[PDB]
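Bench log, entry 3. Co-assembly request; chain sequences pasted below exactly as received.
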Amino acid sequence: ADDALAALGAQLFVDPALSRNATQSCATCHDPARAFTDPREGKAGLAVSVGDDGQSHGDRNTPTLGYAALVPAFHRDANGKYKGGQFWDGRADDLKQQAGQPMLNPVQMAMPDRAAVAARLRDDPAYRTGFEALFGKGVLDDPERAFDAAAEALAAYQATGEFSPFDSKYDRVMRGEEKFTPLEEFGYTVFITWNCRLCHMQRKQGVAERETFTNFEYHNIGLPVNETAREASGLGADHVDHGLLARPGIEDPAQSGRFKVPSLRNVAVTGPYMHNGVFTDLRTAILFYNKYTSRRPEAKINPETGAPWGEPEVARNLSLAELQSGLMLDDGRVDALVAFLETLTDRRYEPLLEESR
Amino acid sequence: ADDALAALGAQLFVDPALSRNATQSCATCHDPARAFTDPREGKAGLAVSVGDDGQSHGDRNTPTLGYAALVPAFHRDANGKYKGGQFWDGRADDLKQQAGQPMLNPVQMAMPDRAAVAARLRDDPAYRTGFEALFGKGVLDDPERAFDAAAEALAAYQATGEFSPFDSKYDRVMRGEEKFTPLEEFGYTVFITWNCRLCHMQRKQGVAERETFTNFEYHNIGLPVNETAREASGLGADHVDHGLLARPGIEDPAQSGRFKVPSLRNVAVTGPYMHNGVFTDLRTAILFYNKYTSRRPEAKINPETGAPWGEPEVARNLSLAELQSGLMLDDGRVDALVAFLETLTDRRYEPLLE
Amino acid sequence: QETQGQAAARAAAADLAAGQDDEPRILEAPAPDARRVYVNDPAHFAAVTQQFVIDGEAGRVIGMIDGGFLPNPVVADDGSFIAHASTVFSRIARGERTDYVEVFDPVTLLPTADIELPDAPRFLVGTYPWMTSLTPDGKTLLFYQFSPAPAVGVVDLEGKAFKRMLDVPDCYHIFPTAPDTFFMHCRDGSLAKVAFGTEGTPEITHTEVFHPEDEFLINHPAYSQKAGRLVWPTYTGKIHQIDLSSGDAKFLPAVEALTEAERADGWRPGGWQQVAYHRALDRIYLLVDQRDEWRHKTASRFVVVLDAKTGERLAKFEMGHEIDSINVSQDEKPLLYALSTGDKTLYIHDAESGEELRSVNQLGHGPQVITTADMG
Amino acid sequence: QETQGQAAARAAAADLAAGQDDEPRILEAPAPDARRVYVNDPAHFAAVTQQFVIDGEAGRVIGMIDGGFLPNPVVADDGSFIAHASTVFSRIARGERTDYVEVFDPVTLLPTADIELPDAPRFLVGTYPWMTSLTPDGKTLLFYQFSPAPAVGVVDLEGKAFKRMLDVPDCYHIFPTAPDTFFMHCRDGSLAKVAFGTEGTPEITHTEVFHPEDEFLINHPAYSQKAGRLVWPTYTGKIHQIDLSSGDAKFLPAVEALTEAERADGWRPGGWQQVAYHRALDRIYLLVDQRDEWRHKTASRFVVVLDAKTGERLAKFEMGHEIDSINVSQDEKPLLYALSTGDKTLYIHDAESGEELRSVNQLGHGPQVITTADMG
Amino acid sequence: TDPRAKWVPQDNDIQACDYWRHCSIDGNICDCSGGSLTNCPPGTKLATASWVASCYNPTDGQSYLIAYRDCCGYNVSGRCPCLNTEGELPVYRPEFANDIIWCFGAEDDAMTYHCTISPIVGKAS
Amino acid sequence: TDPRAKWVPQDNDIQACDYWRHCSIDGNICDCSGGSLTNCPPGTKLATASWVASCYNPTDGQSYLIAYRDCCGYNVSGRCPCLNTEGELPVYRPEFANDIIWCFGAEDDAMTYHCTISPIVGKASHHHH
Ligand code: HEC
Ligand code: HEC
Ligand code: HEC
Ligand code: HEC
Ligand SMILES: [Ca+2]
Ligand SMILES: [Ca+2]
Ligand code: NA
Ligand code: NA
Ligand code: NA
Ligand code: NA
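Structure output for the full assembly:
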C-alpha cells in the first residue's frame, strides 16, 4: 500500500501522458537528474519553465521537490506568522493539493480538465491495474476520484526517501562520519550566528532531527522583478507578484510581497535563485543580503548585472528587522557560506557540484 | 608717647579750627554719638555730608571710623585682589594718609593748604605744647611737619580702643559671656553659610582674632546712582563713580565700579547705606542682594522707592560668581540677618538701636 | 527548596529533551500586583541610577528601569503606570542639565511619556520619596524645587506637559490630597495647604504650629495618599500622625514608638526610610536600634510595629541584618520589605512574624528607597 | 609609614594652631610625570565609567575623569594631554547615541575639546587599549569600528574634527606607527599595514601569515609606540614580537614565557592586560598561573619577567594578589603596576624585586586597564 | 571557587556561572534581571547578532552550539555576573569572541549591554 | 566600626570617616579623589553654598563651625565615602541638613556631586547640639 502507492506515483511522475500534447511529465520540469528542477532553457533562461504547449512560460522559478515532503501543511502560527504550504506563495496547503495544479494549468501541462486526465489514465492498462488495486474498481471512470488518486500517488512518491535522502555531507558530518573542510566549518559557524539562521533553520532554538534549512515562514526580502521572466510570463509591466497575499483567503496587505523561505538543501545545484529565478549564481543570492547591511556602494549593485539590484517589486513589508543586522558579510564569509551550502547537496548530486564550483 | 599722641589726636578731632570758616571738625561729620557718622540732614538727606562752607555736598556717604584701624594698608594680594586702604575707593593707603584729605578738600573742611592748617595750630597755646612734646620744638612753624603730625595724631587717636572696642553683643557671645537669641543665631548661621561670608568675613577659613565683617576686598555689587545725592554733589548727571579705579595707580578696567567691602560693625546705626547712601534702611541693603538670586517680581524693586532698583552705575565687573548664589533670602532670613547685624553694634551705641 | 535558577534549569532540560521550540523574545513583566516592589538605587549620589522591579512573592527581579541623578520615583497606586523625575547631563555629570519626567508602562517598562521640565527645576537631594508626588487622579506630578526658593512644579501627565511653578512659603515635601491641592511642611512648624487653580498665586493656609523648634521631624515620613494619613516620626521615635482626608489638616494624638526605658537605654529610630504605614491595618513600622543622638541615618537591626490609633507595640522584630529602609505591601498579609543599603539586598519578611522569607541581592550600589503601589 | 591622610591631619592641625588662612579652591593635579598612572574602570559594562589619575610614587589619586559606555582611553606619551573616545545616550543607556572624543588638560583635567563622531561609529567592546590609538604626534586619534564591517575612524585632535572612516580588511586593533600609518592584525594570521590620506583608498599591505590558525593571539598585546615593539602573547605564553620601528613589520624570534615543565604542569598566561613591556629595559612581564586552558581571562598571581631578546627568565614574582592587568612605568627603576579587577585595587610593585610598595584601592567597580605615558 | 580550575558544567542551576550553557558567556545572566534563559527582560531589546560556543551538556553527554545573544538598551544589570571562555577565541575570530557587545540588530539601535541569553542552535560539529 | 555608637572624633587622619571635621559630612572626602581637606579636585566646581556644623576638635577642646562645601560636576568619586550627622537637622532646617546637594553657586551651574570639603569658618556653639 505505502510502497505500492508511491510506486504508482513513480509511474505518473514520469508520464507525459498527463500533458495535453503528451510532451511533458512532472519529471520534465522537476528533473531527477537536477535535484528535481528544470534544466531546460526558455525565453528567460532557466528562470521560469515552459509548458506543454512549448510556448507558455511561468512567472516563477521551478523549485526542487527534494525535501518538499518535510514542509508542514500551510497554517498561521500563534504569533500571526504564516508557515508552510507549497508553491512559493503557499497557495497550496500541501503536496497533494499541489499535485493536480500543474496538470490543469494551461501554462504548464495544460490538460483541459479532470476528465481529460482520467481518460489518459484509462488508456494505460498498467494504470487501470495499479490504480484499481489501491483505490478500487472503476476509480479511473470517475474523473474526480482519478484526479485525486493521481495527486495522492504523486504526493506519496515525493515523500519517499529518494526525494529526501539526508545523505549530504552536512548529514554525514552531523553523524560524526566525517568532518567539514575548515571553509565549510567557518561557513556553518557564520550561517548559524548570522541572520541566515533567523530564517533558514527549522527551529528558533534547539536542534532539528531533519533539518531542511528553512523555517517555512513567509518573508519579503525585497527582491526586484525579474524583467526577462516577467516579459516571458506575459503577465504585464504593471503586474505585481504579491506572494503570499495571492493565496486565496489571505487578505492582509502586510503579506504582500512575502514568499516561502526555501529549503537550502541542494541549493548549490538548483539555480537560478529566488522565486523568480532572478539570480543565476549562488554567491549572488548571498550577496543580495548585504544590501541591508553594508555601507559600501557595491552592496547595492547586483554583481550579475552591474546595475542596482532594483526597486523591490513590493516595497512594503520587508523583513527589515532580520535583514538590517548591522553586519556586512565580507568575501571570506560569503565564500564560507557557499562552501557550507554546497555541503547541503545530496550524495547523488555531488557530481553536479563540479560545474557550479 | 602713644597715649599722648592719641590724646593730641583727640583734641584735633573735635577742633573746628581745622576748617576754613572754623565751623567744622572731623567730629562734625564723624559724630561720636552716631558711630562716627553724620547725623546732619542736608539736601540729599543723610546720603551725603555738607562742608564747612554750608553748601558743598559730597558724592559719598560718610563712613564710620569705628574699626577702620583694623583695615590693612592697601595692597594687591597674590591672587590679584586688591585689599585694604581707606575711603570707599581705597584711594588712601591707610589712616595716616587719609587724615589730611578732609582738611584740605574744598567740599569738606576747606583749608586752603597746609600752611593755613599750621597757622590755626599756632593760634592755640595748648597745641604748641602738645605737638612740641611729641614731635619737637617748632613743629608747628613747619606746615609739612605740622600737617603730617596732625595726621599722625588723628590716626593714632582712631587706633585707640575707643574706636574699636569689640564690645558688641557678637563679641560677648564669641567669648562665651552671652548667647545669641534664636533669631540672632539663625542670622549668624545664614550669614556664614550664605554668600555674605564670601565678602563680609576677614578670612576664607579658620577664625579671626578681631573679626570686622569685611575681607577688605573691592567688589562691584551693581548699585544704582543715588540721584538726589548726585544732584546735591554737583558732579554732573553725566558723572560716573568708578570706585577703586579712581585710586591713582589703579588702571585695571576690571576694577571700575568696585568699592571696599565695609565692616558691618555698627551697621545698624550708620544708615543710610552703601557708598552713596542710596538706601536709608538696613533691611533694604540686605534685600538688594536678592536681585541676583530671586526670580520674583518684588526682588527687582527697591522697597524704599517702589520702583526698580536702577541700572548699575557701573554695569561691568559685577561680582556675579558671588552674588548669583542660586538662593533667595526669604523674609525670615532677612529678619534673621537684620538681627544678627544688630549684634555687631558696639555697646555704647546699643541705645541708638531705636 | 528548589530555587528559581534550578527550576529554570529543569524546564530548559525538559524543553530540550522534548524538542520544544520557543522564540527568543522580549518578555513582559507580570501584571502589577500588590506584591510588586520597587527598589530605587540612588547609588550613593552616582550620576546614573537604577530601579529594580521585583516580584516580592517569588523574590525575583522582573525588570529594571534606568534613571539619572537622584531621580524621584513614583508609582501610581492603581498599578497603571510608574514614573520618575530624573536629571541627566549632556556629558555624564557635566554639561547641559535636562530635568524630565518619564512615565512607563508597568509591564513592558517602555516609556510612554518623556516630559522636559524647563529651567532645570528639580531639587537634587538624597532621595526623599515625598519630594515628588502624584496627585490622586494620576494626572499631575508635583515636584519640589529648593532653588532659588521653595517652590512646587506642576507637571500634566495627561497632556504630557510641564504647566508652571508654584511659589510657596518656606516649606518642604509635597503631599497631594486632590487634583489641585497638596500640603507641605514649613520651617515655622506648621503644615501649609496649597491649592492651585490653573492660574495665579495659589491659596496657602497654614495649620497651627504642631512641633517646637527643637523637635526634629525626619526627611522620610510615610504618606498614604489613599488614607490621607501623614505619618511623621521625630528623631526620638515620637510620631506625629496627620489626617488630611477631610481636605484640611487635623492632628492625631501624637504617639511614642519607643518606651522611656528604651530611650534611656539608647533606642532611637535610624536609617533612611525609617517608617512604613500599612493603610488597611492602620499600622506603623519603625526602624530602631540602640544608637547615639546623632547617628540617626545609620542602619537598624530591629523594627517595632505599633498600632496607629493606640500606640501599642505589636511586635519587635530582630531583622537579622543591617536595615536602612522599610516599607510594606498594602495587601492582606503584607510583606515587610527591609532594604539593606550595605548588603544591597532587599530582605523580604513576613510582616506578621518578622521571619525572613527570601531575599533579593545584588540590588545596585546603594539601594535606599522602597516603593509599592496601594492597589487595594 | 605615615599615611597621606595622617600627614594631612597633622598639617591641617598646624595651620589651625598657627592661624594660617588658605583659599578654598580647585586644585591642579601635579604635573604629569613618569610615575603617573591611569586606571580605567569599564565598570563591567556600565553606561558610565571612570578613570583614576594616580600618582604611582605616592600612591595617591590626583584626579578623575568621567566617561561613558566602554570608553577607550589614550594618554599622550609626552604628557601633554589625555583623551578618550566615549559614548553617551540621551537617556542613560537608551535613546540617541552620541559618540565623541574628549581631550583633557592633564593638570586641570578640563576638556579642551569635545569632538562628535558622526553615525555612532565606535566599537563597543570590553576595553582593549589598542582599539583606539593616538598617532605618535598626538594630532590624530584612530578608533576601530566593527559594524557593519571592520573599519577605522580618523579624528583630527588638532582641528577638533572627525575626518573619515577607512575601509580595511577583516582585521583588528590599531597600532599606529606614523601620522598616516597603522598596523592591524588580520583574521588570516597576517598583519595589515594601513596607510591613509585625507581622501582616497588607503594603501593596504599584508605581511606573511605569522601564526597558525590554532595559535591564538590575545586581545591585549603590549605595544610600545616609541619602540615600535608589538609584543603579542598566545594563550600558551608563547610570545610573538613584531618590530614595526622600520615602518614595516619584522618578525622577531618567538620566546616562551613559561618552561616546558611549567607548561606540562598547566602554567598558562591569563587575565586582561596580561602583558607589559618596558621599553628601556626591553623586558616583558607576563601574568601567568596554573590554569586550565580555557580559563584565560582569569586573574593570575605570578608575573614572569623575561628578557625580550633571549627569552631568558629574569624573575618570577609572586604577586600575592589576584591580578588581572599589569603595566609598568617607563622610567628607570620602574614600578610594576598590578591591577586587581576584583579588589578594585592597583598594587604598585617595585618591578625589580617584585615587592609590593603601596596600593590605591577603591578604584571603581571593575577596573581593568592601566595606562602610563612613556615620557622618556 | 578556584578561578583557574577547569570549568565544570552543571545542568542544575541557570543562575550560576557553571551552568552548562554559559560556557562562553560574558556579562550577566538575563535570567537574573527579569529575562529568562533564552529571553530578554522587559524594556530591553534583543540583538540578532550572536557569538557561539560548543558547550557540553552533562545531562545528555552531547555538545551543543549555544549562540549567545545580548539584551540591549539598558545599563548593565549588575546581577549574576559571569565570565566563561570555553573555546573562546580572540576578537579576530569574532564568532567565538565574547568581549564584544553583541547588540547588533537590536531594535531602536540599542547598543548598551544589559545581559546575555543562552539559547541552543544546534549540535556541535 | 559599631555604626550606631557615639561618634568619636580624631584629629589624626583626614581620610577616615572619624576625622573631627567631618562631623556632618555626607558623601566622599575630597582628599581621596585628588582634592584636599579644604580644596576640590581638578575638573570639579566649588559650590558657594554650604551646610554647616559645629564640630568638636578633640585636640584643643574647641568647637568649630565647619561649612561643608561640595565639589560638583563630576560623578561621585567612590573613594572614602562617609556619612556623619553631628548636629544634622532635617531638610526644613537646610543650614544644617546634609542630604542636600549643596552645589549652588558652583561654576557652570554644576550640580552633580563629587565630594565634599571640610573647612572651618568660625567658632560655634549652636542652641541645638
Ligand atoms: C511546466 C513546468 C512544471 C511542470 C510540468 C510541473 N511543475 Fe511543479 N512547479 C513548477 C513551478 C514553476 C513551480 C512554482 C510555481 C509557484 O510557486 O507558483 C512548481 C512548484 C511545485 C511544488 C511546490 C514546491 C515548493 O517548494 O513550493 C511541487 C510540490 C510541485 N511543483 C510538484 C509537481 C508535480 C507533482 C508535477 C507533475 C504532476 C509538477 N510539479 C509539474 C513547474 C512545473
Ligand atoms: C528574513 C528571512 C531571511 C533571512 C535573514 C535570510 N533569508 Fe535567505 N531567503 C529567504 C527567503 C524568504 C527566500 C526566498 C525569497 C524569494 O524568492 O522571494 C530566501 C532565499 C535564499 C536563497 C535562494 C534559495 C532558492 O532556492 O532560490 C539563498 C541561497 C538564501 N536565501 C541564503 C541566505 C543566507 C546565506 C542568509 C544569511 C546571509 C539568508 N538567506 C538570510 C529568507 C531569508
Ligand atoms: C564734610 C564731612 C566730613 C568731614 C568734616 C570729615 N570726613 Fe571723613 N569721611 C567723609 C566722607 C564723605 C568719607 C568717604 C569719602 C570717600 O570715600 O571718598 C569719609 C571717609 C573717611 C575715612 C575712611 C573710612 C573708610 O572706611 O574708608 C576716614 C579714616 C575719615 N573719613 C577720617 C576723617 C578725619 C580724621 C577727619 C578730620 C580731619 C574727617 N574724616 C573729616 C566725611 C567727612
Ligand atoms: C561680592 C561680595 C559681597 C557679598 C557676597 C555681599 N556683600 Fe555686602 N557689601 C559688599 C560691598 C562691596 C559693599 C559696599 C558696596 C558699595 O557701597 O559700593 C557691601 C555693603 C553691605 C551693606 C551696607 C554697609 C554700609 O556700611 O553701608 C550691608 C548691610 C551688607 N553689605 C550686607 C551683606 C549681607 C547680609 C550679605 C549676604 C546676603 C552681603 N552683604 C553679601 C560686598 C558683598
Ligand atoms: Ca531555483
Ligand atoms: Ca552709612
Ligand atoms: Na532575468
Ligand atoms: Na489573497
Ligand atoms: Na536719594
Ligand atoms: Na586710577
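The CA atoms of residues 99 and 346 of chain C lie 29 Å apart. The longest strand of chain C covers residues 94-104.
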